[PDB]
Design an enzyme around this catalytic site. Structure first.
Site, short mmCIF file in Angstrom:
data_model
loop_
_atom_site.label_atom_id
_atom_site.label_comp_id
_atom_site.label_asym_id
_atom_site.label_seq_id
_atom_site.Cartn_x
_atom_site.Cartn_y
_atom_site.Cartn_z
N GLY A 101 -36.14 45.92 112.86
CA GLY A 101 -35.16 45.77 113.57
C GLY A 101 -34.35 44.56 113.30
O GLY A 101 -34.65 43.49 112.80
N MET A 102 -33.05 44.81 113.26
CA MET A 102 -31.95 43.58 113.50
C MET A 102 -31.59 43.42 114.94
O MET A 102 -31.48 44.35 115.38
CB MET A 102 -30.76 43.56 112.77
CG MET A 102 -29.89 42.20 112.77
SD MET A 102 -28.43 42.11 111.88
CE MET A 102 -28.84 41.81 110.03
N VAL A 103 -31.68 42.13 115.15
CA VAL A 103 -31.61 41.71 116.76
C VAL A 103 -30.55 40.80 117.03
O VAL A 103 -30.46 39.81 116.29
CB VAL A 103 -33.14 41.11 116.99
CG1 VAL A 103 -32.88 40.81 118.67
CG2 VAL A 103 -34.19 41.93 116.94
N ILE A 152 -29.55 37.15 116.06
CA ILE A 152 -30.58 36.51 116.18
C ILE A 152 -31.39 36.20 115.10
O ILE A 152 -31.84 35.13 114.56
CB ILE A 152 -31.46 36.76 117.43
CG1 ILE A 152 -30.72 36.59 118.91
CG2 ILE A 152 -32.70 36.16 117.47
CD1 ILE A 152 -31.41 37.41 119.78
N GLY A 153 -31.90 37.40 114.88
CA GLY A 153 -32.93 37.60 113.83
C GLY A 153 -33.47 38.86 113.58
O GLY A 153 -32.58 39.84 114.02
N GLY A 197 -36.66 41.46 111.98
CA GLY A 197 -38.08 41.79 111.55
C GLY A 197 -37.99 42.67 110.22
O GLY A 197 -37.19 42.70 109.57
N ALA A 198 -39.17 43.23 110.09
CA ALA A 198 -39.09 44.15 108.93
C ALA A 198 -38.38 45.32 109.18
O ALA A 198 -38.07 46.16 108.32
CB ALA A 198 -40.82 44.61 108.75
N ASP A 242 -51.00 43.98 116.99
CA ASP A 242 -50.13 43.17 115.84
C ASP A 242 -49.80 42.05 116.47
O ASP A 242 -48.46 41.61 116.14
CB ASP A 242 -48.84 44.12 115.45
CG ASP A 242 -48.13 43.43 114.28
OD1 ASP A 242 -48.88 42.52 113.38
OD2 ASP A 242 -47.20 43.50 114.22
N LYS A 287 -31.96 45.31 119.82
CA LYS A 287 -32.52 45.56 118.70
C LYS A 287 -32.09 46.82 117.97
O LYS A 287 -32.31 47.91 118.53
CB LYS A 287 -34.08 45.50 118.71
CG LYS A 287 -34.94 45.81 117.31
CD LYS A 287 -36.37 45.37 117.49
CE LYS A 287 -37.14 46.25 117.86
NZ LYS A 287 -38.77 46.08 117.88
N1 LIG Z 1 -35.64 40.35 123.52
C1 LIG Z 1 -35.42 39.41 122.59
N2 LIG Z 1 -34.89 38.22 122.76
C2 LIG Z 1 -34.86 37.35 121.60
N3 LIG Z 1 -35.14 37.64 120.41
C3 LIG Z 1 -35.73 38.59 120.31
C4 LIG Z 1 -36.10 39.66 121.09
N4 LIG Z 1 -36.76 40.63 120.67
C5 LIG Z 1 -36.88 40.24 119.23
N5 LIG Z 1 -36.14 39.13 119.38
C6 LIG Z 1 -36.27 38.59 117.86
O1 LIG Z 1 -36.21 39.51 116.81
C7 LIG Z 1 -37.24 39.23 115.85
C8 LIG Z 1 -37.64 40.76 115.51
O2 LIG Z 1 -38.30 41.48 116.63
P1 LIG Z 1 -39.32 42.56 116.40
O3 LIG Z 1 -39.24 43.38 117.70
O4 LIG Z 1 -40.63 41.91 116.24
O5 LIG Z 1 -38.75 43.56 115.25
P2 LIG Z 1 -39.48 44.68 114.32
O6 LIG Z 1 -38.70 44.60 113.14
O7 LIG Z 1 -39.32 46.08 115.03
N6 LIG Z 1 -41.04 44.25 113.86
P3 LIG Z 1 -41.59 43.20 113.10
O8 LIG Z 1 -41.60 43.24 111.38
O9 LIG Z 1 -43.20 43.24 113.59
O10 LIG Z 1 -41.08 41.80 113.61
C9 LIG Z 1 -38.41 38.60 116.67
O11 LIG Z 1 -39.36 38.03 115.94
C10 LIG Z 1 -37.74 37.63 117.48
O12 LIG Z 1 -37.19 36.40 116.71
#
Ligand SMILES: Nc1ncnc2c1ncn2[C@@H]1O[C@H](COP(=O)(O)OP(=O)(O)NP(=O)(O)O)[C@@H](O)[C@H]1O
Ligand SMILES: *[C@H]1[C@H](C(=O)OCc2ccccc2)C(=O)CC[C@@]1(C)C(=O)OC
EC number: 2.7.11.24
Length: 348
Positions: free
Chosen positions: A27-29, A21-22, A24-25, A139, A44
């Site tokens: 996690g890979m999701v 999907i995508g 963040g800084a 955040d 994630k």
């Molecule tokens: N449950 C979910 N269902 C679908 N997409 C998701 C879900 N959780 C996260 N995503 C996607 O994955 C991206 C990263 O998730 P996130 O929990 O923000 O990761 P992070 O690396 O832990 N923190 P951050 O750097 O603040 O984004 C999000 O911005 C969404 O696009």
């Protein structure tokens, strides 16, 4: 184990058919299929154990999301990690699957006022629950506002969350170094103490402004430029505004800047609903003690068609961490994460 973009996702045999999907800084999701419950999920992957601050994020997100239960807050369904602490290098957090996030949505479509109103309602409805548990998200931003096909909105990404405690929180400045600062309240950038629930209302106001124009309202390039963006629209702070800045250094810095006039909201958003701009004005107030609170925001005329306290649940009791984590070494945090996730292991 299944691989995604050259990354191990070691989540089988229960979870299969992974699709990126995508990210963040941290996690890979991926989306995935849960073969046990016969449902679609998101997963994630994080790998936090070489960094104290990343361990903090992972432990906070897990503890808080497993205690919360609300329609506008993402739930944790399952957590996968290795059976021994020495083997544990990655953590996989399994959540309900959402379709996109508001960051991605705003890059491809303009929202009608009805759409903006409904999304803002759902954000504040989730935030009402978070704040009723005495938690600060800290955040909020478009990318952690998730949306599904039925246009339900859920807040995610709780790794910076903390219990609200302005009088007795000596944690200091945010230790998040990668993600965006465009949604951070002016007191977060100026003070190292005394953060209240008002920091989240500021973030929501920034999100509202962005829904109204599809552009971020305060897109600073660095620390001092972020401040200049805020002051260039709100105008120079008043004398009373300046007292909220406890750091006399920061306050004398603000005093040293050239005078700036306020920009009326209807110059920035000439076609917007005047009720939306009235609520925006009350959310983006420099002084946090004067900023509108979440229940008052829900009761604002802009949200009239949705506001319903009979259908806006709150937490039973305020959330507590049972310990302060900011001074624990990462090896201790790894033990706590192992312990917090054992309830998803066979034989717990
Ligand atoms: N449950 C979910 N269902 C679908 N997409 C998701 C879900 N959780 C996260 N995503 C996607 O994955 C991206 C990263 O998730 P996130 O929990 O923000 O990761 P992070 O690396 O832990 N923190 P951050 O750097 O603040 O984004 C999000 O911005 C969404 O696009
Ligand atoms: C909801 C809708 C929405 O939330 O889309 C989810 C989505 C978008 C893109 C890809 C995958 C899923 C909107 O964005 C417009 C407003 C809503 C309320 C709608 O569709 O009403 C008709």
């Amino acid at each position: 184990p299944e691989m995604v973009r050259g990354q191990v996702f070691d989540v089988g045999p229960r979870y299969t058919n992974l699709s990126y999907i995508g990210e963040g800084a941290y996690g890979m999701v991926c989306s995935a299929y849960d073969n046990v419950n016969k449902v679609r999920v998101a997963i994630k992957k994080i790998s936090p154990f070489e960094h104290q601050t990343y361990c903090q994020r992972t432990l906070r997100e897990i503890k808080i999301l497993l205690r919360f239960r609300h329609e506008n807050i993402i739930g944790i369904n399952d957590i996968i990690r290795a059976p021994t602490i020495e083997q544990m290098k990655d953590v996989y957090i399994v959540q309900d699957l959402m379709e996109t996030d508001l960051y991605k949505l705003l890059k491809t479509q303009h929202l009608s006022n009805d759409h903006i109103c409904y999304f803002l309602y759902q954000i504040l409805r989730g935030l009402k629950y978070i704040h009723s548990a005495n938690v600060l998200h800290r955040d909020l931003k478009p990318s952690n506002l998730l949306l599904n096909t039925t246009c339900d909105l859920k807040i995610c990404d709780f790794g910076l969350a903390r219990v609200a405690d302005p009088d007795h929180d000596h944690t200091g400045f945010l230790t998040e170094y990668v993600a965006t600062r465009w949604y951070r309240a002016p007191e977060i950038m100026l003070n190292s103490k005394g953060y209240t629930k008002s920091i989240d209302i500021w973030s929501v106001g920034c999100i509202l402004a962005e829904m109204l124009s599809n552009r971020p309202i305060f897109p600073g390039k660095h620390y001092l430029d972020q401040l200049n963006h805020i002051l260039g629209i709100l105008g120079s702070p008043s004398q009373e505004d300046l007292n909220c800045i406890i750091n006399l250094k920061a306050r004398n810095y603000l005093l040293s800047l050239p005078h700036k006039n306020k920009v009326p909201w209807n110059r920035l958003f000439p076609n917007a609903d005047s009720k939306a701009l009235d609520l925006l004005d009350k959310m983006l107030t420099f002084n946090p003690h004067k900023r509108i609170e979440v229940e008052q925001a829900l009761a604002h005329p802009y949200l009239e068609q949705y506001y319903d306290p009979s259908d806006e649940p709150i937490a039973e009791a305020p959330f507590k961490f049972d310990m302060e984590l900011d001074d624990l070494p990462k090896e201790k945090l790894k033990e706590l994460i192992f312990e917090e996730t054992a309830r998803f292991q066979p034989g717990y």
